[PDB]
């Protein structure tokens, strides 16, 4: 009851993050970095996924918030080689590029040196590590292209 000293004992929503419904990019301060995308490029699908899991678990143990873990579209490139005593290119092998991205935020400037040192020391063979600041273009690169929108935009140009 309101007048009783036990008023408000049942309150619970002040302990819960307000969830009242794409995502705004939060730039970091002078001492903390903003949203960061940790790209993991490799020719082996297992290596890319396994290291992304390792990075995701590493951040949790380091109390670093992980915004989102997702996979970039697979790139398939044909590999052709020139035949001996010939001028014709013949297909040799097919290579698929797999990219895994782990999105983190709130990284401290002083702690960035330690975090980058640990991840680069554990990088598997054949895996490329690239850490970039999150931008709108990178997020928009995960969506299908819209030729119909482009065609209408060309008329306006």
């Amino acid at each position: 009851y309101k007048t009783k000293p036990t008023h408000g004992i049942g309150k619970y929503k002040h302990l819960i993050k307000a969830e009242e419904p794409v995502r705004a990019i939060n730039l970091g301060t002078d001492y903390e970095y903003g949203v960061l995308n940790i790209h993991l490029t490799a020719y082996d699908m297992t290596l890319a996924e396994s290291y992304a899991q390792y990075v995701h678990n590493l951040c949790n143990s380091l109390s670093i918030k992980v915004e989102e873990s997702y996979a970039m579209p697979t790139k398939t490139i044909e590999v052709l080689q020139l035949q001996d005593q010939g001028s014709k290119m013949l297909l040799d092998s097919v290579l698929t590029t797999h990219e895994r991205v782990v999105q983190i935020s709130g990284l401290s400037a002083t702690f960035a040196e330690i975090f980058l040192e640990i991840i680069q020391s554990s990088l598997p063979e054949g895996v490329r590590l690239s850490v970039k600041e999150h931008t709108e273009e990178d997020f928009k690169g995960r969506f299908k292209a819209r030729p119909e929108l482009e065609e209408l935009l060309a008329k306006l140009k």
Partner: peptide, 29 residues
Amino acid sequence: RRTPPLGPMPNSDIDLSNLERLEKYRSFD
């Protein structure tokens, strides 16, 4: 009309400033 509580209210030790950084239960047990 209000009356102050006779003692420490529940969940008073919870720091609401760092609610995002606070560890959650995440489980029923």
